[PDB]
Design an enzyme around this catalytic site. Structure first.
Site, short mmCIF file in Angstrom:
data_model
loop_
_atom_site.label_atom_id
_atom_site.label_comp_id
_atom_site.label_asym_id
_atom_site.label_seq_id
_atom_site.Cartn_x
_atom_site.Cartn_y
_atom_site.Cartn_z
N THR A 229 31.55 10.39 42.15
CA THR A 229 32.11 9.58 43.24
C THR A 229 31.09 9.36 44.35
OG1 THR A 229 34.42 10.18 42.79
CG2 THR A 229 33.87 9.56 45.09
N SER A 245 35.64 7.02 30.62
CA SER A 245 36.98 6.52 30.38
C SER A 245 37.23 5.24 31.16
CB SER A 245 38.01 7.59 30.76
OG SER A 245 38.04 7.77 32.16
N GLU A 266 30.56 0.83 30.69
CA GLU A 266 30.69 1.03 29.24
C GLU A 266 31.88 1.97 29.04
OE1 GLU A 266 28.55 0.13 26.55
OE2 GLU A 266 27.05 -1.04 27.67
N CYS A 300 33.00 6.16 21.06
CA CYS A 300 33.53 4.96 21.69
C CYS A 300 33.83 3.89 20.65
CB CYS A 300 32.55 4.42 22.73
SG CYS A 300 32.17 5.53 24.11
#
Ligand SMILES: [Cl-]
Ligand SMILES: [Cl-]
Ligand SMILES: [Cl-]
Ligand SMILES: [Cl-]
Lengths: 509, 509, 509, 509
Positions: A229, A245, A266, A300
């Protein structure tokens, strides 16, 4: 008690790992943050410890990274390419033990661990040549006596946040390209692959230090949501490459947009394989198996949705069941195993929740569905039939080896069903029909960023750009002109004539 | 009372404009929202009226656009280019009256109004050839029997929100490129240039209809923030190109990111001209004047900051004042006029506030500073000396002809001052020094998207990509590979071999 | 007696043609060489006359073009593109009459004559955008303080020699590209299409005159071999584009190589269509017919060899015989006509000689084979079976509608048989097999410059480079980066630093 | 007697060289032609022997290379890049001994001999990334249901003829690019550098063998004019890269043209440095010295013409004279030595002949002009003033360190004088004037393939295309898209639709 203190795992020391490892690198090694211990998912045992970044660690590292950028950006790109070539060689020297670490801490099988390191090695060798090629066109200006040039320059500091499932290659893609493009890098890897991040950073740090370059060029700040963050909100982070995610990427995308920074996203995939009636089933069945169960279904690009034409559905499902029964399960470093454990105990529980939810929505478990009676985070690779393509559990990405199988009849509907989910990463059709193949590649075909034919949803090479559309976030990595996301374009006009603008009846001196 | 009802303005009818005009086009014309009257900024007289889009008008137009896309995406790109070629021809046919309308409703001088239409014509002619070139490389796969292709396909519906200051060219840049790329378009122009939007849409609609194409390919929904916000939130709008203020664009960027859409943002500029001691002052003074006062200081690329080396500061400022005194002010359609009115009365108020603030922050008005006592929205072009380069008013974009002038001594500090503001659109140095020029173009040079040498900040042509960095929003329009923002990239692997993946000890059937 | 003097052909005057026409243009019109009369191949009647270039006319023209080059090369490329755009518009305005002249003087059917003009129109529209794109990359130097640029500049004078069968489009391809690239052009068309060359040149001349440009930018010197040989030997002709027979082109290539000039060779084709057993026969038969009989089999890309898999050979030949019987023959300007006359009577004699030789070598004429009993140069389109693929008559290019049909069994042999001839222009396979298609496009596939799938050998559009390999001469025209053959590349390094090379122990000052 | 038998040169054995060496490699080593002895130009002593190629040797090697091509062309280009990467590493490991051999057999100083190996190493590392990039665009067809792709495939066998003065790098440029492009190579190096050609071939051969590839992929047939002529005339040699004199290259170019082959010609240079009055003389003087006497003036890019503005002519000559006097002469392998011997005794006689002729034409020898009284082929670096720029001795390429110095006044004449020679390889201006620099790079500037600013005529880097215009032959090597010369372009249209051509009123079934 720690795996690194047992003689059986002494090879870990070849990566410079100790029982407690520094998780901050900026030219110096440190870490005043929270100490985490990472565990081996194959036996639920602790491996070693990593001291993560405090706020002050992060603050100092950005400043050192940005000071290092002043030196790094002045190095000609082909000479930066030479640095990246040496990183590739340094990875080549450690590929086995580094790949073993990926197998030990993340849990994928050895061939995939080494294969993930090889992908980084390859992108390095690729980037070496690219370092002599990046740039823009010199264009013909419509103005006499003017030159028109498109220049490309580094954006500055590239923050790179990566995920547990590809703990080497995603960073490596971002690192190699950002580096030859003249950027410095700050890496925050997944906390559960902290040892991998440290070990990779040790290999890079040595190359940088051996070349009398500031180590902050490839900085590391191990941490979790707090550090990520901070990077997402930090105006000093000019590009934030985020792999993770969909939920978190959205928040990262918003935080970066709020400050007019750049993001490269991504995110999740919900990838479909479609088998038409004319498909080579001896190709469909192994491609589906490996795309579904490879890496215990934690890629993924893992195949999660298998649409089969009604005429061949039962046969393909039956042939998959007989093939699933032969999948060899065990420790990821034993070379006989094709299938290892899920990454966490939570993921095992989530696997069970999804199977149950699939049953609640009317699906039939025709193979697997259960936890394995052995130590570690092992679950059976699972096939679910009978769901409708719009089933809720099928529209969720669960990092578990569950393959949902659907029937279809005609090309138009199944193309629409491929496209109907929120993710847009990878997709595959298996067919021999020439027109269908080009329609699949066309504007009414697959809406994904990876669009494959007679090959599964997995296994992309470095020559092409890698990424997806829709909620997959739109960023691209590795090949083609993906390097442009790591640089800023300028359109530059040089007036070199002695000509003077028109006075327009103003008398100038 | 309405200008279009006076015989003096009968030429407006040559654009098919009437007393009250429909501001929605989607194949049909309509508009059930509020009726807006637009005014001539040179005399405040009302020109004509436009019936804007209601919410229902917007809804129907989006559905019709997306239905039209299904047809339009199937038309081969060179044939779509043929359509764009005819749009260019249709604009050439009306260029004088259309440019007259730009001068009348927006208020820039005739040569620029005409020139803006020419810019749209030129990007059309450019897009014709580009429509035979868009695409990606076929790449050598590392795998035998595999083809590796980078495909580009349209994103779908391109929403285009444009601003008052270029009510033709910005739309045209977006339209021509979006169209050859296979997209449909929905235009919401600035409310105060609604007649220009309608007149342009009438031209395009005729081309589409004559070619038996659904008009919704180039849809129009005249409206204000409410319609603009609807577009930002609308998942059916695959790409939103927004040109406007940084404040609104930030919200547009966030709303689009929230739903994983694509945005193309062209926001504020705070563009600097730097004159070094070796500069050709006979080039500096006129270049600075025209870049400062052109379009009444209302271009995105208008020069707002003038850095002059201490050795030449007073001479350049004195010569600038004497040239400003010769600026011919009048109606923008009159033949010898160089300087017209600001676009709105609010812009006059913003001008006065900025001048007031500059004095409060220590600046001196050495020329201008006042509203002109005449009909219309006329203000004096203004020069402010004595502010520190970091004064807050100098870091704000005011769409008014106020030039803030600074001293500098050395190259390194003044490059940093060019780069220190939040905007990053255009920039310009005037110097003869070869090394300085290439440093300006380099990684420690200008951080802007337009980086010019011995030409002002408004030097840009269609062949290059147009846009900026940082708070300018990052989008690019027109030339180079800017077309890629209007398409989605796919990396496509076709296995054409009869080869079967490796068994890996599973016995298939 | 001359057709231009008859009232039915008064439309010829819309092209500026008269009873006797000047065949030299260099800004002024003249011609002191021999007067040639061209005849209509549909009825052998004289059309009009053209005064060709004497050697002195040739000398005057090269000098005028080279002086004009000094002006033309200083005009910015996009502005040169604007000139080419008006040439497209000027051709569009005369497309019908010019297409009729092509049909009248050359003898191809009206729809193809009109279509050939459209090709020139299209390459013009294409070149306009290309004029804003030609150039090379700016590359990252390995040296600090150095710029590395790839520049492209005109070669100077482009001599363009064209053939009878495409008397408009080939020149147009070369003209439009050479022009935006900053070259001047000197055109020597086929003597039997002299009126077409004048008509095209009159159209271009007016555009150059209306734009106040020297007419010698698009010079014309009508003549035969003597003028062509002077162009090949003239060091002032920097690039010679030659389209014609292999025999002449080989001598042209040698003459240009002797003087270290540049040549662009577009020579013969001996093009094959291959139909595999899985091919769509309803696609094969029309594609083969039209590719063989289109333009009376006088295209460079005409299908002359038809390989059919053993299993379908008899069926395809029978369906082709039944379709040939429906070919509608008549005057090329008559509506509904599919097939016109051969261009010359010598071509009639060459056709008959080839048919006789085919029989003498063991071939069977299964359709056609005879001269038609009517005025003009009409011969029946011909299909010959039973020859071996290596029959000598089949390995010669005879510009006559004779289709040699062969059997094959295996993919490797028939690919080899495609490649065994000396020419290497166009090639086509008809099949559904995905693996076969990509092998055909691969390194073991067709050796030709045009490699088509499920479309005949004449499927070319302007977006791609057009040309062949082997004895076809290797040049490329029109699309892709073909423009680079009309320009000279320079690799330019600019040291903008104050750095001084290493003394290497020499004491400098 | 042989240097290889003396203990001081025992390091030659690390390159696999012995007293008598085989000069034919095609997978097996041999040589049935005449045995050549190569001599060290620093002491006129014999080093060792090489058995050259007989006619049978050439025939067998071509056949084996063409067989190997069948395997090599089927290897995916990125895997071909992996081989070239290993050639780069194998060169890196032997860079000292190989560079020493270049100094010993050819005679340039050690740092330049080592530097030539590095240029091969660098083009290898470059080609690794390029091997994942070569290809063409997929283009948008104008036809619905059609794909349009530009394919590139290997040409086959690339014959490579190189010269004595760059016996490693030129072959290396051709080898690395040809290899990743899927071609096999046949090398005939200069006879007097036969040991270098053998040594490089041994290094590549081991890499090929260690990778289980046929050795004939990188074949060697040492020989002189007879082998080179056979290569020029051999249709099995698909591309002939020839580096050498203009005299031979012209004949090679004609022989290749006669058979419609492909040639890449890198011929003589007569390269000029131009110093304007505003030039940094502290930059001009060392740059000129190193460009004239570097490699004893035996580079293709050696500066032979030095135009100096009359205002600074006398000063520049004097500073050059004082600097030439400090050139350190000695054995090329000796450290700190800057100047070695000419390559042959014939070159000494040519130098003397040229000096006398220069005096005969009115030139004054202001430094050097005489043979040095010491063993080896040492001649004094020479500066000649007083010639007219068009003096006959100045228009010949003489491979001797003779620098011809001319005066000029204005830019236009000196640009014209640069361009007036028959060669067109390299060129430099030294100036600070911005307008002059871009005029130099433009259509009225240098006509050469290498166009430099404030750096000498030497020092090309790997990123750009390397080659010249006019009598330099037009070929390009190394960077940019030079790889395209080693491949054949095909324009491929795939019809994938079920659509049938238009009946055109023919009733097919
Ligand atoms: Cl002034
Ligand atoms: Cl199976
Ligand atoms: Cl000096
Ligand atoms: Cl039929």
């Amino acid at each position: 008690t720690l795996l690194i203190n047992q003689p059986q795992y002494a090879w870990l020391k070849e990566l410079g790992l100790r029982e407690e490892n520094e998780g901050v690198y900026n030219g110096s090694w440190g870490g005043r943050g929270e100490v985490i211990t990472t565990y081996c998912p194959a036996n639920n045992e602790p491996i070693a410890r990593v001291r993560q970044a405090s706020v002050a660690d992060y603050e100092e590292t950005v400043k050192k990274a940005r000071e290092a950028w002043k030196i790094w950006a002045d190095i000609p790109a082909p000479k930066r390419g030479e640095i990246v070539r040496q990183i590739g060689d340094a990875l080549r020297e450690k590929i086995q033990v580094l790949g073993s670490l990926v197998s030990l801490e993340m849990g994928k099988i050895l061939v995939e661990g080494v294969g993930e390191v090889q992908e980084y090695v390859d992108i390095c060798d690729y980037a070496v040549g690219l370092s002599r090629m990046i740039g823009g066109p010199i264009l013909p200006s419509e103005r006499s006596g003017h030159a028109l040039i498109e220049q490309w320059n580094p954006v500055g500091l590239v923050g790179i946040i990566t995920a547990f499932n590809f703990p080497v290659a995603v960073y490596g893609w971002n690192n190699a390209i950002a580096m030859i493009c003249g950027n410095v890098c700050l890496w925050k890897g997944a906390p559960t692959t902290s040892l991998i991040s440290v070990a990779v950073t040790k290999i890079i740090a040595k190359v940088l230090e051996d070349n009398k370059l500031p180590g902050a060029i490839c900085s590391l700040t191990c941490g979790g949501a707090d550090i990520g963050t901070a990077m997402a909100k930090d105006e000093r982070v000019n590009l934030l490459s985020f792999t993770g995610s969909t939920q978190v990427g959205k928040q990262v995308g918003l935080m970066v947009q709020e400050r007019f920074g750049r993001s490269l996203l991504e995110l999740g995939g919900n990838n479909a394989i479609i088998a038409f009636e004319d498909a080579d089933l001896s190709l469909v069945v192994p491609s589906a198996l490996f795309a579904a169960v490879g890496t215990a279904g934690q890629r993924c690009t893992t195949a999660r949705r298998l649409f089969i034409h009604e005429s061949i559905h039962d046969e393909v499902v039956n042939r998959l069941k007989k093939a699933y029964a032969q999948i060899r399960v065990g420790n990821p470093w034993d070379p006989n195993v094709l299938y290892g454990p899920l990454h966490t105990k939570q993921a095992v529980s989530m696997f069970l929740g999804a199977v149950e939810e699939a049953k609640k929505e009317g699906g039939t478990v025709v193979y697997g569905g259960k936890v394995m009676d052995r130590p570690g985070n092992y679950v059976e690779p699972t096939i679910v039939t009978g769901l409708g393509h719009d089933a809720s559990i099928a529209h969720t990405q669960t990092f578990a080896p569950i393959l949902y199988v659907f029937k279809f009849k005609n090309e138009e509907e199944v193309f629409a069903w491929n496209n109907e989910v929120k993710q847009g990463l990878s997709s595959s059709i298996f067919t021999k029909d020439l027109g269908r193949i080009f329609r699949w590649l066309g504007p009414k075909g697959s809406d994904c960023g990876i669009v494959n034919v007679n090959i599964p949803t997995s296994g992309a090479e470095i020559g092409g750009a890698f990424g997806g559309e829709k909620h997959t976030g739109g960023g691209r990595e590795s090949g083609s002109d993906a390097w442009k996301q790591y640089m800023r374009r300028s359109t530059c006009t040089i007036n070199y004539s002695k000509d003077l603008p028109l006075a327009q009846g103003i008398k100038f001196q």
